[PDB]
Design a protein around this ligand. Structure first.
Ligand SMILES: *[C@@H]1O[C@H](CO)[C@@H](O[C@@H]2O[C@H](CO)[C@@H](O[C@@H]3O[C@H](CO)[C@@H](O)[C@H](O[C@H]4O[C@H](CO)[C@@H](O)[C@H](O)[C@@H]4O)[C@@H]3O)[C@H](O)[C@H]2NC(C)=O)[C@H](O)[C@H]1NC(C)=O
Ligand SMILES: *[C@@H]1O[C@@H](C)[C@@H](O)[C@@H](O[C@@H]2O[C@H](CO)[C@@H](O)[C@H](O)[C@H]2O)[C@@H]1O
Ligand SMILES: *[C@@H]1O[C@@H](C)[C@@H](O)[C@@H](O[C@@H]2O[C@H](CO)[C@@H](O)[C@H](O)[C@H]2O)[C@@H]1O
Ligand SMILES: *[C@H]1O[C@H](CO)[C@@H](O)[C@H](O)[C@@H]1O
Ligand SMILES: *[C@H]1O[C@H](CO)[C@@H](O)[C@H](O)[C@@H]1O
Ligand SMILES: *[C@H]1O[C@H](CO)[C@@H](O)[C@H](O)[C@@H]1O
Ligand SMILES: *[C@H]1O[C@H](CO)[C@@H](O)[C@H](O)[C@@H]1O
Ligand SMILES: *[C@H]1O[C@H](CO)[C@@H](O)[C@H](O)[C@@H]1O
Ligand SMILES: [Mg+2]
Lengths: 48, 109, 124, 207
């Protein structure tokens, strides 16, 4: 049951800014991208 | 331009309460946004906050005591260094006109 | 920033008197408007008396008005609460409060700096 | 009867605020010559409440803007989902506006997402509503104000399931219709979409 994940050349890493950090106008374009990404995978999953 | 500077803007009454002093400029008194200013002391108590629309006043009395009339109420864009929603300069009023009816009895005498 | 030390409490009989004093930091004394609070056994914190930074404008609660008289000493960095006609309902821990006021004539009811307190017990 | 004069234009109290403007005081208290026994009093002006000026602006907390307009209701890799039983998603945006000088940030979520059906430009069956409440006098303070009430052709929304399941969890979510449809109805007084009636306002006052 112990498990180690590998950050190799086939691993995507992206920074998630916190709740009060999304109030900047520079991160306003990015935080609306990350929020809609979760509900399309939680409620609908992957098509095809 | 020197303007009387107050220490507290009483909201919903439009009254400048708590006097701090006079003769200070408008740029210096509004460094704290919880303050208020009053030019010429004849009225127009403006807060140091960003220009937002104030609350609508209560309705004016009905223009006739009989049958269908009309009544007004005003709203003043309060604030400084900015424009209200609709390219509106500060100090401009907006009115709304509604038809009223006080009673349905007429010439009682 | 500012620190408050209370003194003057004690066991007074019913009908007697007691005078409290509050020593604050000297370098930041006249900045804060100050007042008096209390906390009885089994109740919330209760506003007692307040005084402005001038000492001219005073404010009191309705339960202590007439009997209590708040005074400000702007030279010895102390305030005083002259408590006359002590009743058994005045048994509480009196806290000295310090809070920033912009005008010199404004009394406050909300304060951000508080002290350790002093014990006042009135018996019958 | 001790004659009282004035002391110093006294020692300064420190400026009681780290931002903007404040009020120090010194006055001139009648302390170096005190009137005693109730004789004469100190003559002049004892008033000094001084405006101290700190050259640092104070923090201002940002306020929320109004909610924006709802985005078009689509679904990924599902062509157009209009007039079908395909649940999609839509978004809405706000703007934290006004935070300057190390003020507090806006408390809350800046995006609002709900599940939707696309009813944009879909023909539907309809029914005529009753007479609405009489509107305001437009234009106010201008030449000839008139009231306006109307009966509009309200569409009959189709009986779709009001909830949808999620893939990851068993808990269900709300579905809410969005769009501007084209309602079909019989005519009333020569109109197909909306019939109104205008009545002028009486006793218009000066503004
Ligand atoms: C999806 O949207 C719907 C609205 O279209 C939303 O329904 C909400 O339901 C709650 C609970 O029923 C409503 O709250 C009510 O408020 C009124 C007063 O305004 C009360 O009288 C109600 O109490 C009665 O109803 C309860 C059951 O309905 C009983 O348990 C209770 O004992 C009383 O009989 C009730 O508190 C609310 O007004 C609506 N509408 C909203 C929130 O807009 C539903 O919750 C939404 N779903 C999700 C997941 O968001
Ligand atoms: C308000 O009260 C009414 C009961 C009337 O006494 C009004 O007087 C006048 O009545 C005539 C009707 O003959 C109306 O045209 C007007 O409302 C008014 O001038 C009174 O103003
Ligand atoms: C001095 O430094 C400033 C940067 C602020 O942090 C000041 O705090 C202010 O304290 C008053 C209370 O008297 C509040 O009204 C202000 O909201 C707050 O900014 C600090 O004193
Ligand atoms: C005036 O209009 C309404 C009151 O009916 C509110 O949206 C608000 O109070 C505004 O000031
Ligand atoms: C105006 O309309 C009525 C009074 O006629 C009330 O609901 C309220 O005072 C409003 O301002
Ligand atoms: C958006 O949400 C509601 C209106 O639907 C209000 O709480 C407010 O106007 C906010 O901007
Ligand atoms: C989105 O939701 C409705 C339209 O269905 C309206 O309240 C408004 O246009 C909002 O932006
Ligand atoms: C409105 O139009 C006519 C009345 O003229 C009816 O067919 C029906 O009531 C519709 O809703
Ligand atoms: Mg597949």
């Amino acid at each position: 049951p112990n498990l180690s994940y590998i950050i190799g050349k086939d691993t995507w890493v992206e920074h998630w800014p916190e709740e009060d950090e999304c109030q900047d106008e520079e991160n306003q374009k990015q935080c609306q991208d990350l929020g809609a990404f979760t509900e399309s995978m939680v409620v609908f999953g992957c098509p095809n | 331009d020197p303007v009387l500077c107050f220490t507290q803007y009483e909201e919903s009454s439009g009254k400048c309460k708590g006097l701090l002093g006079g003769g200070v400029s408008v740029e210096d008194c509004c460094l704290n946004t919880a303050f208020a200013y009053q030019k010429r002391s004849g009225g127009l108590c403006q807060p140091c906050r960003s220009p937002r629309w104030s609350l609508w006043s209560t309705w004016a009395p009905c223009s006739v005591t009989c049958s269908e009339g009309s009544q007004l109420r005003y709203r003043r864009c309060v604030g400084w260094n900015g424009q209200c929603s609709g390219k509106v300069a500060p100090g401009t009023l907006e009115w709304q006109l509604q038809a009223c009816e006080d009673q349905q009895c007429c010439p009682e005498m | 920033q500012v620190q408050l030390v209370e003194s003057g409490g004690g066991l007074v009989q019913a009908g007697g008197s007691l005078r409290l004093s509050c020593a604050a930091s000297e370098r930041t004394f006249t900045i804060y408007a100050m007042g008096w609070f209390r906390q009885a056994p089994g109740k919330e914190r209760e506003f007692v008396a307040a005084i402005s930074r001038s000492g001219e404008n005073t404010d009191y609660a309705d339960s202590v008005k007439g009997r209590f008289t708040i005074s400000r000493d702007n030279n010895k960095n102390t305030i005083s609460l002259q408590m006359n006609s002590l009743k058994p309902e005045d048994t509480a821990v009196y806290y000295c409060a310090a809070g920033r006021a912009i005008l010199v004539h404004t009394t406050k009811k909300e304060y951000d700096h508080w002290g350790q307190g002093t014990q006042v017990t009135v018996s019958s | 009867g001790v004659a009282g004069g004035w002391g110093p234009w006294g020692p300064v109290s420190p400026c009681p605020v780290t931002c903007g403007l404040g009020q120090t005081m010194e006055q001139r208290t009648c302390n170096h010559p005190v009137p005693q026994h109730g004789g004469p009093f100190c003559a002049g002006d004892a008033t000094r409440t001084h405006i101290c000026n700190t050259a640092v602006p104070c923090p201002v907390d940002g306020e929320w803007d109004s909610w924006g307009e709802w985005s078009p209701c689509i679904r990924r890799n599902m062509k157009s989902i209009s007039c079908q039983e395909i649940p999609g998603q839509q978004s809405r945006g706000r703007t934290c506006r006004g935070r300057k000088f190390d003020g507090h940030r806006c408390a809350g979520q800046q995006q609002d997402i709900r599940h939707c059906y696309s009813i944009q430009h879909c023909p539907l069956k309809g029914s005529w509503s009753e007479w609405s409440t009489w509107g305001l006098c437009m234009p106010p303070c201008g030449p000839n104000p008139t009231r306006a009430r109307q009966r509009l052709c309200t569409p009959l929304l189709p009986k779709y399931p009001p909830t949808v399941s999620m893939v990851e969890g068993q808990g269900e979510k709300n579905v809410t219709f969005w769009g501007r449809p084209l309602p079909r109805c019989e005519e009333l007084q020569g109109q197909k979409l909306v019939v109104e009636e205008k009545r002028p306002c009486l006793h218009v006052p000066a503004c």
